[PDB]
Amino acid sequence: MLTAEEKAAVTGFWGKVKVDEVGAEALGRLLVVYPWTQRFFEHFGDLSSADAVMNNAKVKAHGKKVLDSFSNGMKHLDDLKGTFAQLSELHCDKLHVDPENFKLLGNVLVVVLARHHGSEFTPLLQAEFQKVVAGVANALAHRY
Amino acid sequence: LTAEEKAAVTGFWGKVKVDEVGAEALGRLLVVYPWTQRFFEHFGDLSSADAVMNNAKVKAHGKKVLDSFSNGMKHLDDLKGTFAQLSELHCDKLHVDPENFKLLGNVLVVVLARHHGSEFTPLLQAEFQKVVAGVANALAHR
Amino acid sequence: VLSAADKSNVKAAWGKVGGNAGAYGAEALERMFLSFPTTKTYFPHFDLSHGSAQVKGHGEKVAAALTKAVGHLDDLPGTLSDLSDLHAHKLRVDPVNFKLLSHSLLVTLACHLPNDFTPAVHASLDKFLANVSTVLTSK
Amino acid sequence: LSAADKSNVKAAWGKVGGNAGAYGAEALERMFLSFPTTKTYFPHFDLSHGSAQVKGHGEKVAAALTKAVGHLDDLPGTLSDLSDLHAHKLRVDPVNFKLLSHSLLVTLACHLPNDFTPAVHASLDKFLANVSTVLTSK
Numbered sequence: 128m129l130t131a132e133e134k135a136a137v138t139g140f141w142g143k144v145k146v147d148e149v150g151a152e153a154l155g156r157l158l159v160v161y162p163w164t165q166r167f168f169e170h171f172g173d174l175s176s177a178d179a180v181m182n183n184a185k186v187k188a189h190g191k192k193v194l195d196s197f198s199n200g201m202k203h204l205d206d207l208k209g210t211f212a213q214l215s216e217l218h219c220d221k222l223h224v225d226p227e228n229f230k231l232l233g234n235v236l237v238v239v240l241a242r243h244h245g246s247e248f249t250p251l252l253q254a255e256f257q258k259v260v261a262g263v264a265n266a267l268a269h270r271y
Numbered sequence: 272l273t274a275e276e277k278a279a280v281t282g283f284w285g286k287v288k289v290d291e292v293g294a295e296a297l298g299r300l301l302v303v304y305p306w307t308q309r310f311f312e313h314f315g316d317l318s319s320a321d322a323v324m325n326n327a328k329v330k331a332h333g334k335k336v337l338d339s340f341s342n343g344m345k346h347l348d349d350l351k352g353t354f355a356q357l358s359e360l361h362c363d364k365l366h367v368d369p370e371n372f373k374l375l376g377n378v379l380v381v382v383l384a385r386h387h388g389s390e391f392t393p394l395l396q397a398e399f400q401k402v403v404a405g406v407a408n409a410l411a412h413r
Numbered sequence: 414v415l416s417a418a419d420k421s422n423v424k425a426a427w428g429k430v431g432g433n434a435g436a437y438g439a440e441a442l443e444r445m446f447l448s449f450p451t452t453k454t455y456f457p458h459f460d461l462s463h464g465s466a467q468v469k470g471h472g473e474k475v476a477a478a479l480t481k482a483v484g485h486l487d488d489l490p491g492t493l494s495d496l497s498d499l500h501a502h503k504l505r506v507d508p509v510n511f512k513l514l515s516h517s518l519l520v521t522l523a524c525h526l527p528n529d530f531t532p533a534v535h536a537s538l539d540k541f542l543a544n545v546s547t548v549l550t551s552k
Numbered sequence: 553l554s555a556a557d558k559s560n561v562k563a564a565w566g567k568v569g570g571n572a573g574a575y576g577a578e579a580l581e582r583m584f585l586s587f588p589t590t591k592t593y594f595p596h597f598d599l600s601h602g603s604a605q606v607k608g609h610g611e612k613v614a615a616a617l618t619k620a621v622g623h624l625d626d627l628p629g630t631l632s633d634l635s636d637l638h639a640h641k642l643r644v645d646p647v648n649f650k651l652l653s654h655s656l657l658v659t660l661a662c663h664l665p666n667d668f669t670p671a672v673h674a675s676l677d678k679f680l681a682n683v684s685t686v687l688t689s690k
């Protein structure tokens with residue numbers, strides 16, 4: 128479910144992203160758009176509002192590592208499963224994030240890339256990425 | 272799940288009215304989740320609740336799925352292997368996306384407490400809650 | 414979202430539930446807890462083993478909250494305003510939990526009321542419970 | 553449901569404008585590339601990029617949201633004729649609404665970066681949520 132031809136594009140494109148901004152932004156959006164996700168992050172201090180959540184350094188911080196995991200996810204594309212086999216543990220037995228929530232973070236990622244890349248981010252190229260997030264979110268929930 | 276449970280689950284399953292349990296589960300689904308109707312729109316009259324509950328292929332399909340639900344009670348480890356062939360139909364030719372299995376796993380368990388009442392212990396749900404989880408996932412493999 | 418035949422089916426099932434409400438809630442929760450343990454973590458400091466004073470007592474409340482619901486069926490927004498408030502803003506219950514409690518009501522209603530638990534009442538009660546669930550995670 | 557959603561979803565929809573059509577089509581097409589199961593509800597459509605019917609229908613979807621947006625108070629009101637179609641005849645599985653709604657959020661974002669903030673985006677999403685809980689309910 129990713130051809131060598133399907134793999135360029137998404138590997139190509141992917142080094143046009145501001146991985147770190149992008150990231151910070153997903154996680155804020157995720158948190159604002161899906162308010163209950165705020166639980167797993169009560170410790171990050173204030174989330175009273177849209178802006179607080181956006182301009183909160185730890186959202187931003189956490190912004191950076193998750194998109195980091197995609198990047199590393201991206202490098203390893205045939206073995207998401209195991210690249211993310213540890214991060215299932217953390218996410219499943221420990222914080223017990225329900226699977227559905229992963230999906231939500233992917234879809235949101237997608238939205239963030241469409242806003243940053245506008246029409247550079249084509250319908251075709253967004254279909255391949257859907258296969259990235261799906262697989263990632265498939266993989267994060269494997270130990271379920 | 273550990274034999275301690277593979278054989279408190281078999282004990283119940285032996286007592287279940289398999290012919291009619293499937294018939295009824297498959298009707299409630301189509302009824303409770305009215306959209307699932309369109310995969311069985313060629314079964315005929317799904318035009319209301321009694322029509323569903325009393326539509327003979329709803330009946331027969333009920334059987335065959337609930338009997339497919341027995342073979343799995345046998346091979347509780349390779350529920351993958353068992354339900355490779357039906358994940359085939361479901362995801363690829365039938366496209367049914369796998370929220371809908373969970374649904375039917377659940378509707379089966381709603382049904383069980385209907386037929387067995389207080390004997391369907393809070394602790395015997397959970398048991399079956401697992402089976403109906405794996406079985407939802409077996410199918411969802413492809 | 415929901416029909417006239419729904420409001421009815423609800424007010425028809427829950428009348429039969431009757432002075433028992435208290436208990437069924439107690440049993441929905443109990444059944445929600447062995448069946449979906451990751452549910453347990455919303456009740457940290459809470460006696461969570463079979464037959465419990467709390468497991469009971471809290472049920473009274475959960476059940477007394479649908480009793481109000483059924484009753485005020487027409488504007489579930491304005492009757493549950495304090496409960497969203499609680500489950501939405503303060504406690505942030507992850508909408509998926511609202512929905513395995515919702516099936517532990519149904520399972521629970523089912524064994525006790527075999528003859529009142531028809532598909533058609535099933536149908537309406539999922540919709541009901543689906544919708545309570547939606548108000549409670551609002552605004 | 554939440555003035556401050558409504559507010560935003562107006563402003564949301566107001567900037568979209570008469571490009572709602574062009575976006576409807578585009579999300580439509582994005583839905584179809586990204587989620588081909590969806591195609592299966594459309595075997596009577598030629599689905600090649602830039603089909604007339606796809607174009608046509610994106611319009612008809614853009615326009616029905618436009619309707620849903622200014623008339624936001626009563627929902628199973630002004631879309632009862634659409635529940636009917638989607639819930640009853642087409643019997644559409646409600647997972648595809650999550651799919652088609654995602655896709656508009658996508659398209660919008662891509663045509664309106666500056667108007668697509670995290671707050672309006674939450675709205676747009678709760679909104680599309682009712683729209684489909686309605687379209688699927690009775």
Ligand code: HEM
Pocket residue numbers: 164167168192193196197214217218222224228229232233263264267
């Ligand atoms: C696209 C899916 C996701 C990926 C790939 C992902 C990845 C990660 C990474 C890289 C970390 C930190 C790793 C480290 O520094 O060791 C992390 C931690 C965390 N994530 Fe996930 N995450 C995802 C989705 C979610 C969702 C949906 C939630 C809640 C609904 C969530 C809640 C958390 C929390 C609370 C931590 C704390 C990290 C720690 O243990 O200090 N994440 N995740």
Ligand code: HEM
Pocket residue numbers: 307310311335336337339340357360361365367371372373375376406407410
């Ligand atoms: C997870 C529980 C399920 C079980 C145990 C099951 C089992 C089966 C079996 C054994 C067959 C026919 C095999 C054959 O003789 O070739 C079948 C067919 C079918 N199933 Fe299911 N299935 C399940 C889930 C579903 C669901 C949830 C739906 C609807 C959303 C569905 C829709 C269909 C359709 C449309 C057919 C074709 C009928 C036919 O063979 O003529 N299945 N299923």
Ligand code: HEM
Pocket residue numbers: 452455456459474475476477478479496499500504506510511512514542545546549
């Ligand atoms: C039909 C839907 C539900 C209703 C009507 C309901 C009802 C209630 C009621 C009446 C209270 C107590 C308010 C008070 O004592 O003044 C409460 C609190 C609470 N609810 Fe729920 N509930 C529902 C679903 C859920 C779910 C799914 C969860 C979590 C899985 C949940 C978790 C809690 C917790 C943790 C508290 C109080 C915290 C504590 O007492 O320690 N509720 N709910």
Ligand code: HEM
Pocket residue numbers: 590591593594612613616617637638642644648649650651652653680683684687
């Ligand atoms: C935002 C929610 C949605 C809205 C507002 C919407 C709107 C519409 C509209 C306006 C029509 C045309 C009615 C007419 O031309 O008289 C329509 C028809 C149709 N829609 Fe939807 N739609 C939505 C979601 C979906 C989804 C997710 C699907 C499945 C992918 C779907 C499948 C269809 C189909 C198969 C038709 C038949 C068209 C015809 O007969 O010409 N809709 N919808």
